[PDB]
Amino acid sequence: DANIPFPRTSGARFCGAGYLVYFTRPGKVIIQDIACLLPVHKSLGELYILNVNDIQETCQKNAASALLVGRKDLVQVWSLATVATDLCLGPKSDPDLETPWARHPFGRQLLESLLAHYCRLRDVQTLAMLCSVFEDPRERERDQHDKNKRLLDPANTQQFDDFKKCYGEILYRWGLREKRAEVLKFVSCPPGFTFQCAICHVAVRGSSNFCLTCGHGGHTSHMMEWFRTQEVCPTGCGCHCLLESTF
């Protein structure tokens, strides 16, 4: 074995989200916590409520969490986001009427400044949350007005989507999936016979289950109630569905 860089006996490595491993020669594998080193925290992650309907409630609820955790620049930035996202500043379709809030210096420019600072600080968490929350004839003017209409530049949608993908991957790392769905809800780009019930016979249109073998199905809560106590097909088929439907 000519190519022999053999005597390997030490190594360090990052693993998980908040973890580190290393071993040495005198030899048990010692790991360590680095949660306070990275700019992201799981504790703050579990609390960050998000919503598409009531934006203000999300901002003011996230505001208290950072104070409950210890961070400060967020208990400022979230307040600024709250005051800079009210429906009173709603844009108007006509370009004549009033200057849009985007062109106000405290509008787009503030967003770019915050994004740049937190890009330097390398904190994908706050980037993801801020971006998610803030998300011949005279004809050739309304298009430009709609371009200037938005608080986020239409020419950098890709980076925002990348931020929102990366935070989802880290959330999957941590062990929370519902939050991974809430965050990803904002991303722009996309990701015979026999139709009756079997326990109440009313036509089903939404969520349902069935056996692969039996071929008898119905409403999901119906099956919860039915299989809470028994092990037979509800329609006199004889299948022990706990041995057929599941793997």
């Binding site: 400060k72 400022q76 307040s79 600024l80 005051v83």
Partner: peptide
């Protein structure tokens, strides 16, 4: 008011 008061 937010920008200049009570950090």
């Amino acid at each position: 008011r937010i920008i200049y008061c009570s950090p």
